[PDB]
Amino acid sequence: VNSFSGYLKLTDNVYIKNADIVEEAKKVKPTVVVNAANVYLKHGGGVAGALNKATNNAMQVESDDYIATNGPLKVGGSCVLSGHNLAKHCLHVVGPNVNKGEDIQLLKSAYENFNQHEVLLAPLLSAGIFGADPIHSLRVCVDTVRTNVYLAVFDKNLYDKLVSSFL
Ligand SMILES: O=C(O)[C@H](c1ccccc1)n1sc2ccccc2c1=O
């Protein structure tokens, strides 16, 4: 039993809700919240910008120190940093950004990072301004992640489309 509430059940291990991931993280205070990161951990826009704003820029400060020490991530890769006021930990996962010309095939590798954590609150990787079809992101998710994932979908109309077309 966990403190997630109001999710539709897609599969044995994947649940989905029409919710703002920022407000959901503040309410649940999950163990792990997933960020839609880029390799530089530059959290300017999208989910990354929104999560970072909710931490009062503490996420960016921590991230810049991480990059200065370790260099960039790989597309498909991840790192675990603090969750600040939103969660215990933030798993920064780099899905491919189609709008940058990155290989959509790396989406499965990106989702594999989720399997290192028993329970996660997450957005649809590579969707939004990363340019991949959210329907495809949900499919790769369900077919890759074996741990318990709670997906927050921001847009109501997209949420409706994702559920009704899910096989
Ligand atoms: O609603 C959501 O959660 C997702 C989403 C996933 C990751 C980051 C930001 C947004 N949306 S809304 C939306 C509106 C127009 C076109 C695409 C999307 C889309 O993919």
UniProtKB/Swiss-Prot annotation:
UniProt superkingdom: Viruses
Record membrane topology: Multi-pass membrane protein
The segment(s) forming the Macro domain are 1-167
Q: Which reaction does it catalyse?
A: Thiol-dependent hydrolysis of ester, thioester, amide, peptide and isopeptide bonds formed by the C-terminal Gly of ubiquitin (a 76-residue protein attached to proteins as an intracellular targeting signal)
**Activation/inhibition comment:** Inhibited in vitro by GRL-0617.
Listed result of changing residue 31 to A: In strain: Mu/B.1.621
Q: What is the annotated localization of this protein?
A: Host endoplasmic reticulum membrane
Q: Briefly, what is this protein's role? A: Responsible for the cleavages located at the N-terminus of the replicase polyprotein. Participates together with nsp4 in the assembly of virally-induced cytoplasmic double-membrane vesicles necessary for viral replication. Antagonizes innate immune induction of type I interferon by blocking the phosphorylation, dimerization and subsequent nuclear translocation of host IRF3. Also prevents host NF-kappa-B signaling. In addition, PL-PRO possesses a deubiquitinating/deISGylating activity and processes both 'Lys-48'- and 'Lys-63'-linked polyubiquitin chains from cellular substrates.
Oligomeric and partner information: May form homohexamers. Interacts with N protein.
Q: What is this protein called?
A: Papain-like protease nsp3
Species: Severe acute respiratory syndrome coronavirus 2 (2019-nCoV)
Question: Covered range within the whole protein?
Answer: 1025 to 1191 of 7096
